[PDB]
Every structure is written in structure tokens, then in C-alpha cells.
Design a protein around this ligand. Structure first.
Ligand SMILES: C=CCN(C(=O)NC1CC1)C1CC1
Lengths: 300, 237
């Protein structure tokens, strides 16, 4: 188990860790989060009490360094930093534990939710989507735009997701216009899986990270990318059986985890109806279809 | 964006544009099979691609052989339309290629957009106007050349005959659409109006009769009356 200590909590803030959150009061004696499972990426995120706009947070992996949070009163946010001095860190952590100034990452042992949401998410891939190579962790916020959004402005602050565009020369073979537009299997299997992503695991990882950014930060660009990656699979007649089964599990846990009151802002009616009822794969997402129907029958 | 009553004069400006109508591309007679089931039999069709300013009509004839062994033909017809329009554009010199293509039916937007990816600067637009180009096969010479074709074929016409020597494009388009609207609403009466006078003939190289200016005003009046008449007969007004 690993720990992310906090120097202090000078401003009142709701702090998220993965799918958990707790409220911290102005200058409450808070010094961080302990018992964080090793082996998964994690995200630690903040929504200030006094200005819920600009949700921000940090993607990190405890195996890649010792990280802590410290409030910056000049830039006005909780910043993640890496501590290079190892004995300084353990000492800080151990003192804060002894004083029990840390919340415990509250993982129910039956519960595989986080694993199931991050199964294919690797830090190395996150850092290629979020470019900032001097830090081992990644900042993402609610307002950050995607490379594709910037096409249709500040490039350094972009989410460099893989651009998917169904009416693009990348998607459409000359001479197979109708074929490729109505059955995206070429685009999925040759262009994206074989060409760009190299395998389904990297494709799923980006999809899962886009969903998590969309739900946790309220990032519109991330919501768009998640739906595009789902639609490219549902709109392909020819998808490996193992991808189809895994997709059903992936989406299941995403829909299961989504707040019930955010359906209006985080789910695209057209995509889900197409994907569940009209697409080639209308019959291949039994678990996702089941949960979508019992939990969001209004959207449909 | 979309084209409508408000931006109606844009059609006659000096930016090259084309209307594409696909309503006569896939044409069938539905009939009964010996077993009492229903089968379709296709007949030749055509893409109606029209420059509204110049009157130049690119009449691509769609021979029934293009459908042989194909499924979901109404869907295919939109993509074959789009394939053939794209090929026309590619065949034209650069300075003749359109800057905009307006489809008369919104179901052509995606097929045409996808076929024209090589031409990002050519705007593909729908229209809110209900244009009567479906009635093009009521023009005898157009119907004739389509039905006689034995192979794929492009035929070029000026749908305005020589009208632009005497009237503007705006007026020539309004006349064309009134004629077509009347042929669409009551083909028989419309054709009776255009030919009632044996002394007014159609030039070998024209589609419509050689009316003087005064005779055209009379003709146009009679076409309006017919359209209003049929509106009462239909609606009982
Ligand atoms: C907090 C903002 C929510 N968003 C949003 O405007 N969604 C609109 C309904 C499509 C983004 C998806 C996260």
C-alpha cells in the first residue's frame, strides 16, 4: 500500500481519490491519503468549495515515484509534486500516520470496480495523451480541449487523444466509399487497431481514460472521445470476439459507476441507441444493454 | 448551410453551383409474381444535375444493369448518385468545378460528402425548398433518351433552351420550376397547355416550344391556374 501525503488543506475542497470523495474544511487538519492499492493508476481530484468551476486532478502511479499534494496560494490550486528524497518522504508519511491525519483509501475487498475501470489504462499511455514530460503524473481539468477540438487553442494544454473522424480520408478507402462508411471494420481493424494503437489493449486503455476524464472532471472533449471509440466498434461488422466480450464488460462498469443524475450530461442518446439497438453489435453487449435498460431507460 | 427562400438570389450569382436531384435514379414498376407475390422491375433512371445560372444539365443515365445482383437498392442509389456526381466534378476542368453542390434531398448529404472528401472546399448543402425536379422525366426528350439508353451514358442539355438570350437566370429558373411544378401536379393538362397550338413547335435542339415573350406570359399564367386548380381539387377549396 502507498500514500499521498498533503502538506496542508488551506482552502475548503472536496477531494476525490479514484471513485471516492471526501469534504475537507478550510484549514482542517488533513495530511493525505493512505492505503492506496499498488498496481493501478490512480486519480486524485479537487473541486473547491468556493468555486466549483475548474475541476482539476492528477493521474499517477505509485510505482513511478513518491508523490504529494501541496496548496499553492499564488496559482490557487492543490498541486501534485514528486519528492525525490526518499527518507524525507517515508518520515513525513510515517509521522502523519502515527498522528492519524490521513484518510484510508476505502477499498471494499469484494469490490473490483477500480480495476475494472482502469484495466487497460497505463501511465505511459496517459503521458502521451497529456504531454508534460518533466512530471511523472498528469494534470487534467474540466476545460482542457482535445487536439481534434482545436482543429475544428493552446496546444501545450491539450488532450492529445487519437483523432477519429468517420467522414475523413483516413476512415474511407477510395473506391470503398459506401462500404467503409456503413461498415467501419477497415477503419477499426486496419487503420486504428493494426496501424495506430497496435492492439486492442491500447485502444481500450484510451477509451477507459477518456471516460474517466469525462465523468470525474466534466471534460466535454473526453466525453466526445469515449463515445467515438464506442461508436467505431459498434459500427464495425467484423470485430474480434474477444474485443466484443471485453467491450461489454468495460462499458458495463462505466455505466455502473456513472452518477445517476449525470446521465443528461455524460451519455449521448444517438450513440447508445445506435450501439445497443441498430448497430452490427446490437446483440453483442448483453451486460451493457441490461444495465443501460434497468438504469437509464429514459435515454432510450 | 441550407438553402431557402431567404437566400434565393445566391443561385444566380457568379459562384459556380449545381443542384443534384436523385429522385429518378432508381425507378421501378411494382408487379405481381406468378405465385401472387410482389416483385419490382427496374427501368432506366437518371441523375438530374443542373447549373441554375447557366441552364447546363448533366443528365447521367443510370442503366438498369447497375442494379444487377445488388441489395438495398434505394440505399445504393444514393451512393451511386454520389459516385457519379464526384466523377463529373473530377472530369471538369478546375475552373468549371462547382464551389457548392445543393442536394434536393437531405439523404444525399452523407453519401455526397463522403465521395467528395477529395474536394474539401466544395460545400455540400441541403435546401428547404421543395423543388419539382422529380418531374424532369415529364420532359419528353429527357424521358426519351433515358429509356432508350442501353449502356451508362451522360447527355448534356441546356434546360433553358435559348431563354437566357432574352431573360435573366432568375427568371429562367422561375419559369423552369413553374413548368416542372405544373407537370408534377397534372402532367396531362400541363402537356396539353404546352402543345395546344399546333403552330408553336419545339426546335430539334430544344426541350420546350418556341414561345414568343407574349406567348410565354400566357403560358405561365395557364400553368399557375393549373397549379392552383389542382390545389383546390386536391384539397377541395
Ligand atoms: C460539466 C459539464 C458536462 N459536459 C457537458 O456539457 N455535456 C453536454 C451534454 C453534452 C461534459 C460531458 C462532460
Amino acid at each position: 500500500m502507498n500514500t499521498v501525503p498533503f502538506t496542508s488543506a488551506p482552502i475548503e475542497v472536496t477531494i476525490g481519490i479514484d471513485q471516492y470523495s471526501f469534504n475537507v474544511k478550510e484549514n482542517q487538519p488533513f495530511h493525505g491519503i493512505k492505503d492506496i492499492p499498488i498496481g493501478h493508476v490512480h486519480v486524485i481530484h479537487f473541486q473547491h468549495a468556493d468555486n466549483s468551476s475548474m475541476r482539476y486532478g492528477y493521474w499517477f502511479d505509485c510505482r513511478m515515484g513518491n508523490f504529494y499534494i501541496q496548496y499553492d496560494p499564488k496559482d490557487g490550486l492543490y498541486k501534485m509534486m514528486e519528492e525525490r528524497d526518499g527518507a524525507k518522504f517515508e518520515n513525513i508519511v510515517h509521522n502523519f500516520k502515527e498522528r492519524q491525519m490521513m484518510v484510508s483509501y476505502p477499498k471494499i475487498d469484494e469490490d473490483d470496480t477500480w480495476y475494472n475501470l482502469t484495466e487497460f489504462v497505463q501511465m505511459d499511455k496517459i503521458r502521451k495523451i497529456v504531454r508534460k514530460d518533466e512530471n511523472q503524473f498528469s494534470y487534467v481539468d474540466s476545460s482542457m480541449t482535445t487536439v481534434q477540438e482545436n482543429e475544428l487553442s493552446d496546444p501545450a494544454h491539450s488532450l492529445n487523444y487519437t483523432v477519429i473522424n468517420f467522414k475523413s480520408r483516413e476512415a474511407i478507402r477510395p473506391g470503398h466509399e459506401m462500404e467503409d462508411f456503413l461498415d467501419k471494420s477497415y477503419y477499426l481493424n486496419t487503420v486504428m487497431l493494426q496501424g495506430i494503437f497496435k492492439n486492442s489493449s491500447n485502444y481500450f486503455g484510451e477509451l477507459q481514460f477518456a471516460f474517466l476524464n469525462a465523468m470525474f472532471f466534466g471534460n466535454y472533449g473526453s466525453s466526445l472521445q469515449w463515445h467515438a471509440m464506442i461508436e467505431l466498434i459498434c459500427s464495425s461488422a467484423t470485430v474480434p470476439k474477444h474485443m466484443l466480450d471485453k467491450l461489454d464488460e468495460i462499458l458495463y462498469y462505466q455505466i455502473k459507476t456513472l452518477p445517476e443524475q449525470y446521465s443528461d450530461i455524460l451519455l449521448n442518446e444517438r450513440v447508445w441507441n445506435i450501439c445497443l439497438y441498430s448497430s452490427f453489435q446490437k446483440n453483442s453487449l448483453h451486460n451493457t444493454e441490461k444495465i443501460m435498460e434497468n438504469k437509464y431507460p429514459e435515454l432510450l | 448551410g441550407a438553402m431557402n427562400s431567404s437566400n434565393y438570389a445566391e443561385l444566380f450569382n457568379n459562384d459556380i453551383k449545381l443542384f443534384v436531384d436523385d429522385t429518378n435514379v432508381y425507378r421501378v414498376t411494382v408487379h405481381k409474381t406468378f405465385e401472387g407475390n410482389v416483385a419490382t422491375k427496374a427501368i432506366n433512371g437518371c441523375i438530374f444535375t443542373l447549373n441554375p445560372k447557366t441552364g447546363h444539365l448533366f443528365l447521367k443515365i443510370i442503366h438498369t444493369s447497375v442494379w444487377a445482383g445488388q441489395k438495398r437498392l434505394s440505399q445504393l442509389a444514393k451512393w451511386k448518385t454520389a459516385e457519379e456526381v464526384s466523377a463529373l466534378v473530377r472530369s471538369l476542368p478546375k475552373e468549371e468545378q462547382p464551389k457548392q453542390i445543393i442536394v434536393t434531398r437531405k439523404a444525399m448529404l452523407d453519401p455526397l460528402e463522403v465521395h467528395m472528401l477529395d474536394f474539401p472546399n466544395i460545400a455540400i448543402r441541403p435546401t428547404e425548398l421543395r423543388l419539382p425536379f422529380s418531374a424532369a422525366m415529364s420532359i419528353d426528350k429527357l424521358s426519351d433518351v433515358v429509356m432508350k439508353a442501353t449502356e451508362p451514358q451522360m447527355v448534356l442539355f441546356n434546360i433553358y433552351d435559348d431563354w437566357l438570350d432574352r431573360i435573366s437566370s432568375y427568371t429562367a429558373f422561375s419559369r423552369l420550376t413553374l413548368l416542372l411544378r405544373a407537370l408534377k401536379t397534372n402532367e396531362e393538362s400541363a402537356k396539353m397547355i404546352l402543345l395546344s397550338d399546333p403552330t408553336i413547335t419545339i426546335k430539334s435542339y430544344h426541350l420546350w416550344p418556341s414561345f414568343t415573350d407574349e406567348q410565354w406570359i400566357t403560358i405561365e399564367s395557364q400553368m399557375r391556374d393549373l397549379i392552383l386548380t389542382e390545389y383546390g381539387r386536391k384539397y377541395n377549396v
